[PDB]
Amino acid sequence: GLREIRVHLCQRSPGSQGVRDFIVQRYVELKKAHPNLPILIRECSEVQPKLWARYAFGQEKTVSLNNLSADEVTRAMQNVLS
Amino acid sequence: QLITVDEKLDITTLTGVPEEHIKTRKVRIFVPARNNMQSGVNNTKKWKMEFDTRERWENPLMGWASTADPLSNMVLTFSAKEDAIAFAEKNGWSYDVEEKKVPKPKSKSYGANFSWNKRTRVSTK
Amino acid sequence: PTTNPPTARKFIWTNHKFNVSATPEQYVPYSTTRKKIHEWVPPSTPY
Amino acid sequence: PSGEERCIACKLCEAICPAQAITIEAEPRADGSRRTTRYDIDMTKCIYCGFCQEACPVDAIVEGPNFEFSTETHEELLYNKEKLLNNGDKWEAEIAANIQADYLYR
Amino acid sequence: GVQVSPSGEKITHTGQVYDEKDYRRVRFVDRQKEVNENFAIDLIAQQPVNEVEHRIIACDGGGGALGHPKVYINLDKETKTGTCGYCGLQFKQH
Amino acid sequence: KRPTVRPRSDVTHKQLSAFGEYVAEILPKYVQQVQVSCLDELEICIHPDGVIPTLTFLRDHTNAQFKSLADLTAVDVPTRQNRFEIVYNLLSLRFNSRIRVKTYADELTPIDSIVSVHIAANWYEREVWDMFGVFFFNHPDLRRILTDYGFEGHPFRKDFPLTGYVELRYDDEVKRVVAEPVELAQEFRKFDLNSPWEAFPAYRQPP
Amino acid sequence: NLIEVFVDGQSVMVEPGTTVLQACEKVGMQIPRFCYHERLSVAGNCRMCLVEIEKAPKVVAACAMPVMKGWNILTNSEKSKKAREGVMEFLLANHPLDCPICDQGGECDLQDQSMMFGSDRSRFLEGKRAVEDKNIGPLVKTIMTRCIQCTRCIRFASEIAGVDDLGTTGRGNDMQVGTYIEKMFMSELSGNVIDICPVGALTSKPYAFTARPWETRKTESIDVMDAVGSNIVVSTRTGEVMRILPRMHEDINEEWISDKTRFAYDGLKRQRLTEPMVRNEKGLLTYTSWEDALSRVAGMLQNFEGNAVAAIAGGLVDAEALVALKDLLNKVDSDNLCTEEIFPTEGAGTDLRSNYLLNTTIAGVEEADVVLLVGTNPRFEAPLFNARIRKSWLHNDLKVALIGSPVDLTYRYDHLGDSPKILQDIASGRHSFCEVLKDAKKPMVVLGSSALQRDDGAAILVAVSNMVQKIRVTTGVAAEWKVMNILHRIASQVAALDLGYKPGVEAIRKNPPKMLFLLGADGGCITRQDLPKDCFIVYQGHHGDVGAPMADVILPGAAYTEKSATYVNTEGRAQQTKVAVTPPGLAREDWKIIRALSEIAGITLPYDTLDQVRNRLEEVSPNLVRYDDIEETNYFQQASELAKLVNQEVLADPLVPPQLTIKDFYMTDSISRASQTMAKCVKAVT
Amino acid sequence: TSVKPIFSRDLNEAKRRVRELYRAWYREVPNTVHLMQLDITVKQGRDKVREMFMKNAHVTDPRVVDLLVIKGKMELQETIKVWKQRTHVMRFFHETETPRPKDFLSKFYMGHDP
Amino acid sequence: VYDQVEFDVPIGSRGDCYDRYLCRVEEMRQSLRIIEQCLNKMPPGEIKVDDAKVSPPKRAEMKTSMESLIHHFKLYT
Ligand code: SF4
Ligand code: SF4
Ligand code: SF4
Ligand code: SF4
Ligand code: FES
Ligand SMILES: [Zn+2]
C-alpha cells in the first residue's frame, strides 16, 4: 500500500535532465489523475537525482534516476506506483 | 629518509581529553559580527573557534552560575578559515562553519537629498 | 575622641558587637535577589 | 550622610578584580533610581589588593582596617550586600577619618 | 523598617523571601539571617526637597570631592522635582 | 626634548643591524628573517636543522661570545602549520649585549637539542616537553617536572583550558585522594574586552 | 568608468559618486564617524570625519566629499589628528559625567574614540549645560543632556518609519532633539534608535540597569516571531538572557529588527513549563517524571493506531520535531500531521517550492519596478519586507498598489478596492492598472497567507495565477525573473509544508481521532468539544494559556534560544539557531523527547543524535541542510496550468487583514501574550 | 605525504618497540602492587594495561605511535623508580565515578547530554 | 637612574659559600651607601606619568572633568 511520493533533483545539471523533462512533460497528468496523493518535488543543487516513495506502515523505497530520460522516468514511476 | 603517507592527521590521543569532551562537542567556526551599538570593524577581521554551550545552572547556596564543562569559555583566534579547519579536523572535533557576512557598496550622492523630481527629498535639515 | 570626636551620624551601630564566630547570632550566606524565572500556576478544576 | 547607599552598579570592581571574586546582579529601584540586588564577595579569593577602592568613583567600597574576622567555617567568608552594609554602618566612624586623611595623596 | 513574612523570615530590602516549601532555609535553623534595618528608600524619602533660584544646579554629593562627580541638573519642569542619579537628592526651582 | 618618551637612539639600531648582516652572510643557510626591533633588540629566525650550528657559532666565535643562555622559552600560535615558536634569549659579557633566536616547530616534528653546549637547557627542555608537547632528541632525562607524575595533556597550549579537566578530593569510602571531573561552583567569567576602534594604524593588515 | 586614487602612496580604483570614506574602507583604514550610517542619509554635523588632502590646503569631511581623480589622501597626519582632538574637546565640553550610569558604558563609540583619537584631559574650567527629559514611550528611556546632536534618529525616522514627528527645536547650545509635545513615538520599528544612537541617551527601559556588555557571552541565533529570518545576537549573563540585538545580514534584516522580537525576551521567563504534568483521578494536573509520562503515553500508543492518532503543530516549533513526528506516525501508519494554520491546497497544494514561498528573493524588491499587495498588512506581519519596500519606493521611483481596506501606511499609493473580483477584472484588462503593468517591466505580486487563511482562498489563488499568466504574456520576462509571491507569518509553516503535511484541520473535522499530539500550538483552533469525550491529548510545548488547560498530559520542550534547530523564512532560506542557554528544570529537547517515546513504545528510530537527524533531513528534503543558500525553481507555469483546471470561485464579501490597530501587532504568540512589557506597550497605545 | 620521520619509519618498527614496552609493563606490575600496598589483582592490572593499549588501535602514523611510546616509557620510569603512589596509580580506574550511561534513555532521564 | 649614584660591587676569589655569604653582607652595606644618596637627592615632582591613556588620573579631575573620567573607565575595564 503506497502512501506518498517525493522526488529529489539537482536543477541545472546533466543527471537531472530527464527528470526535468518528465516534469515539464507529463507530471500534470499524474497530478490531475490522482490528486488525493502527496507528490512532492524538491530540487536542491549538487545532489544525485533520486526518488523516495513511502508506503503505509512507514517503510520506504529509494531509487535512482541519474543519466536517464523521460521514458525511464515514466516506467520507474509506474513500477513503483504498482 | 622522508615518508610517503597520505593519511589525514589526528592527535586526539596526545591531546589528553576524554571521549565525551572530544566527540559530543560541536565546534563552530565563525566571524564575530559587529556590536550594532558600536560602529567598529576591527573585530570582523579574524576567524574565531568556539564550542557549543552546555549546562549552566545556579548554585543553591548563594546563586552563582556553575558549569560541568571547562571548554565553554575556550575561544580561539585564527587569521584564515583553511587554517582553522586544519586545526579543528586535526584535533578531531566536528566543525561547522558560518560563512562571511560582508557589507555591500553604496552610492551616497548627498546632493540627491536636495533633489527636484525624486522622492529622496528630505523635509529636514 | 575626647579631643577629636567623630561625625555625629545616624544609621550607625550604637551597641558594638564582639566576634560572631559560632554564636547563635552568627552570619550565613544567601541570595539577595528574587526568582529569575516564574512559572505556570495550573488551575484547580477538572476541565 | 543622607542614609543612601553609594553603589550604583558601575561594575568596575567586577571588571578589575584580578580574582574575579566579586559577583554583581543589578536592577532598577521602585523609586526609579539605579541600584543593586546582589553584591557578593568571596573573601577566600580576595587577595586584598585595593583595586576596587581605587576604581569605585564614589568611594563606596573601601577595604578597611579590621583584620580580626577569622572564623570557624568557610561560609562566614562569602560576604554579601547586607554583611557589607552592616560592616559599613559599623566602621564608618573610622573610615571617614582614614579617607579624609588619605584622599589628597591619591 | 523591616517587615516579616508568614513564616517569620525577615524580608530583605529587596523582597527576598524563602517560601514555606523551600529547603534552602535550613542554614537559618539554630542561626540568624543577617539584614540591615536602615532602608535607603525611606532614608532618602525623609530628606527635604532642596530649593534654588538658578534654574540649573550642580550636584556633587556633599564634600567637594568624596562625592559623586559634578552633575548638572535642569529644573525648568515645574510639574515636579529634579533628581540626581547618584545621590538620590532632589531639587526644586524658585 | 619630551619628558614622557624614551630616546630612540641610532648606535644600537646600527650596530646590531651590522651584526645581523654579518651572521646572515656567514650562514646564508640555517637562517631566514633576521630583524631588529624598534626598541634595540635583535631577533634571528632559523630552520630547526641549524640550531646547534648557530648556537656553537654564537658561543665560540670571538666576535659574539654569546655565552649565557639567559632563557629558553616556547610560544604557541595555532593559525599556522608549524605552530610552536621556540625561543632562546642569549647574553654576552665582553660585548655587553643580548640576542634572540627563534625557530619554528610543530607537534609531530621534534627538535635538535643543545645540551652539548648550554647545559641550562637540560631542564627548560623538560619543561617544554611536559607543558607544550614539543620533543627533543639526544636528551638523557626527559620527564614531567612541573605537573603531577600521572598528569596527562599539555596545558600551556591555547586549547587545554584554564580550569583543567580534573579536580581532586578525598573520599573516605576508600581513604585515598582521588581525581574526578571538573564540576566547578562558580563559572570562569570571560570578559569581552577587545575594543574595535583601531589605535595602531601602522600595524594594520589589508584584505 | 573607473577612477583612481593614491592613498598614502597606496593606490585604489573606485567609481564616481563615491566618498572618501568608502575609499578608505576599501583600503581598510576605518575613518571616525558620528553622523554617518551606511543605511541612512548624510550630513556634516559631527565634524569628526576630517582628513588632509595633499596638494590642497583646506580639510574636508569624508562623509560628503566625492573623490576627485588624482587626490592623495592623508588620514593619520598632523592637521587631521589636531582637528579630531579639537572636535572631541568640544563634544566632551558638556557631555555630563554619567558614564557609569549610562547603560551604553562599554560600547560607547564616543568613549572609544576619546580614548584612542582624542586627548588626555579637558581645558574646560567652566560650567556645563543640561536639558529637560522627555517621555517618548514605555520602551525608549530618554535622557537628553547627552545628545551630541548627530541627527541619526531624525533621519532614520523621516526615511524608514515615515513617522515624521521627530525633529530639532532651537538654535545654539539651547538646541534639543525630540517632539515639541509629549507625543509617543511608538512603531513596529521603534526599538532600533537604541542601536543607532551611539550614546546612552535613548536607552532601552527593560534592559536598562540590568547588566553591561563585556560581562556577556554573545551567542548568535534567529527570530521566530515572524517568518523573515532576522539574524540575532543573544546576550547571556551567568546563564541567563539579558538582551537581544540585530545581526547584520545584508539581505533579510539589514541591521534592523522588530520591537516584538527584541522585547519579547521576557516572555521566556513567565508562564513557563518545567515538569511533566499529568491528569489526576479528579482531573487536576499533578507533577511527575518522564518515567511515568512516557510509560503512560507509550502504553496507550501501543494500543491506538490507524487514523485515530493526529499530530498538530503550531508556530515556534522546529523542523527536527516535525520530521521526528512524521517518521513516528509513519511507522505507526498514520498521516494526519497538520498545522494550526490554513493554506488552500486544492489543485497542486504543497508539491512545488515554486509555490508557497517567495519565488523572488526579498532583495529583488530593490530592482523591481511595480509592486502589488493582496490583502496584507506587512507593516504588522513581516515589517522588514515593508522597509525594503520603503527604501525602494524612496530610491528607485517605484509604484506600489494594494488590495484591501484603507490601511495606515508610511507612504501613499493607489488603492484598488476590497473585492478580489478586481483580480479577474485585471486578468481581463479593464482597469488602468492593467495598462500600467503591461507598460512597466519586472512587476511583482505578493499575497499573504493571512488571506488564504480565509475560506474562499483557493479560488482567489486561482484567479491570481490567471492574472499572472495574463501579465506574463503581456510583458517580456522569463522565469529568471518572477512575478508571484507568497508571504507567510509563522515560521514552522514552511518547514512543515516542505516535509509534506496537511496544512489545515480538514482531516480532523473529517476523522475525529482518539490520541492528539500537539506541539507549540497555543492557537486554540481545537478543544474538547470538537472531539469525542474519551480522547487523550499530549501538549508538548513551552507556554500555557490555551492548549495546556485542555490537556491530558503536558510535556515541556524549549524555546528559540535553547534548541539548535533549523528554521525557514518565506524564501526557502535555511537558518539554524545555536544553543545559547540550557533550559529550566526537567525540560528537554523535542526530538530527544520523541526518540525516547519511540524507544519506550518499541518503535526505535535510528536517530540517536542531532547529526543523524540532519542526515535524515538531507534524505527527506535536501534544501533544509543547505544553510544560507536559496534554491530557485521554475515549474510555476505547470502549477498554474494545473490550477486552471479548477473552477472554484470566490465569495463577494470584502477582505481584511485582522491587524489594523498597532495593538494587534503585539499579543500574537505565547511570548507576546506573556511578556509584562507588551502590556505596557498596549496600555500606552490606548 | 612528504614529511620527516621520528625514531622510526614504519608501523612495524613502531610495533616492535610497542611490544618491548608491553613486556616491560607486564613484568613490572607485580613489583608495584607489592611495593605500594595496593588491593587490586595482578590480573586486573594487566587488564588495564591491555585496555590502555587497545584504546589506541585506530592509529596509523608512526609518529603518533612513537610519541605514545615515549610517554609510556616516561610513565614506566616514574613508576618503577617509585614516585607515583597509591593515588597516582589508582587514578586510572575511575573508582569514584558512575559509568557514564550510554543508554539514550538514561541520558534523557538524568541530564542534557545528547 | 642606577647610572647616577655610586655603589661598589663585591666579588670573591675562591667560590665557596663563605665568599657568597660575604658578598651578600657587603651588598647589604652598599645598599645603604645607595639609600643615603637616594634620600639626600630625591627631587620633587610627580609620580605617575601624565599620559592619562596609560596611568589613571587623580580623583579630583576624574570627578570634575570628563575625558579623564572616560580614561578612568577604560583603564579599569
Ligand atoms: S581588594 Fe579584593 S575585592 Fe577589591 S579588587 Fe582587590 S581582590 Fe578584588
Ligand atoms: S566600583 Fe563601587 S559603585 Fe561601581 S559597582 Fe563596584 S562597589 Fe558599586
Ligand atoms: S554616551 Fe555614556 S559612556 Fe559615552 S560619554 Fe556619554 S555618558 Fe559616557
Ligand atoms: S538622540 Fe542620539 S541619534 Fe538622535 S540626534 Fe541625538 S545623539 Fe543622534
Ligand atoms: S561623519 Fe562627517 S561630519 Fe559627521
Ligand atoms: Zn547628587
Swiss-Prot record, chain A:
UniProt KW keywords: Acetylation, Disulfide bond, Electron transport, Membrane, Mitochondrion, Mitochondrion inner membrane, Respiratory chain, Transport
Query: One cellular component GO annotation, for this chain's record?
Result: mitochondrial inner membrane
- GO molecular function (one): NADH dehydrogenase (ubiquinone) activity
N6-succinyllysine PTM sites in chain numbering: K50
Q: Localized where?
A: Mitochondrion inner membrane
Q: How does it assemble?
A: Complex I is composed of 45 different subunits.
Q: What is this protein called?
A: NADH dehydrogenase [ubiquinone] 1 alpha subcomplex subunit 2
Shown residues within the full chain: 15 to 96 of 99
Swiss-Prot record, chain C:
User: What residue intervals traverse the membrane?
Assistant: none
Would you say which domain of life the source belongs to? Eukaryota
Q: What subcellular compartments does it reside in?
A: Mitochondrion inner membrane
Q: How does it assemble?
A: Complex I is composed of 45 different subunits.
Main function: Accessory subunit of the mitochondrial membrane respiratory chain NADH dehydrogenase (Complex I), that is believed not to be involved in catalysis. Complex I functions in the transfer of electrons from NADH to the respiratory chain. The immediate electron acceptor for the enzyme is believed to be ubiquinone.
Protein family membership: Belongs to the complex I NDUFA12 subunit family.
Q: What is this protein called?
A: NADH dehydrogenase [ubiquinone] 1 alpha subcomplex subunit 12
Report which gene this protein is encoded by: Ndufa12
UniProtKB/Swiss-Prot annotation, chain D:
Q: What is its EC number?
A: 7.1.1.2
User: So where does [4Fe-4S] cluster 1 get bound?
Assistant: C7, C10, C13, C56
4Fe-4S ferredoxin-type domain location is 1-27, 37-66
| Gene Ontology molecular function terms on file | 4 iron, 4 sulfur cluster binding; metal ion binding; NADH dehydrogenase (ubiquinone) activity
> Which residues are recorded as binding [4Fe-4S] cluster 2?
C17, C46, C49, C52
Q: A Gene Ontology CC term for this entry?
A: mitochondrial inner membrane
The annotation note on the cofactor reads: Binds 2 [4Fe-4S] cluster.
Spell out the family assignment given in the record's similarity comment. Answer: Belongs to the complex I 23 kDa subunit family.
Q: How does it assemble?
A: Complex I is composed of 45 different subunits. This is a component of the iron-sulfur (IP) fragment of the enzyme. Interacts with RAB5IF.
Tell me what this protein is called: NADH dehydrogenase [ubiquinone] iron-sulfur protein 8, mitochondrial
Q: Source taxonomy lineage?
A: Eukaryota, Metazoa, Chordata, Craniata, Vertebrata
Which part of the full protein is shown? 107 to 212 of 212
UniProtKB/Swiss-Prot annotation, chain E:
What happens when the protein's gene is inactivated? Male and female mice are fertile but produce smaller litters and pups have a lower neonatal survival rate. While mice are normal during the first 4 months of life, they are prone to rapid onset weight loss and sudden death after this period. They display cardiomyopathy associated with a doubling of heart weight, impaired systolic function and a reduction in functional capacity. Males are most severely affected, with a propensity to develop cardiac failure and diminished survival after 4 months of age. Defects are due to membrane respiratory chain NADH dehydrogenase (Complex I) deficiency.
- What membrane topology term does the record carry? Peripheral membrane protein
Where is the protein found, in the record's own terms? Mitochondrion inner membrane
Recorded GO CC terms: mitochondrial inner membrane; mitochondrion; respiratory chain complex I
Ordered alphabetically, the record's keywords are: Acetylation, Electron transport, Membrane, Mitochondrion, Mitochondrion inner membrane, Respiratory chain, Transit peptide, Transport
- Coiled-coil spans in chain: none
Q: Could you tell me which residues carry N6-acetyllysine?
A: K70, K92
Q: What processes does the entry annotate via GO biological process terms?
A: aerobic respiration; cellular senescence; circulatory system development; DNA damage response, signal transduction by p53 class mediator; fatty acid metabolic process; gene expression; kidney development; mesenchymal stem cell differentiation
- Recorded family membership: Belongs to the complex I NDUFS6 subunit family.
Its name, as the record gives it, is NADH dehydrogenase [ubiquinone] iron-sulfur protein 6, mitochondrial
* The organism of origin for this protein: Mus musculus
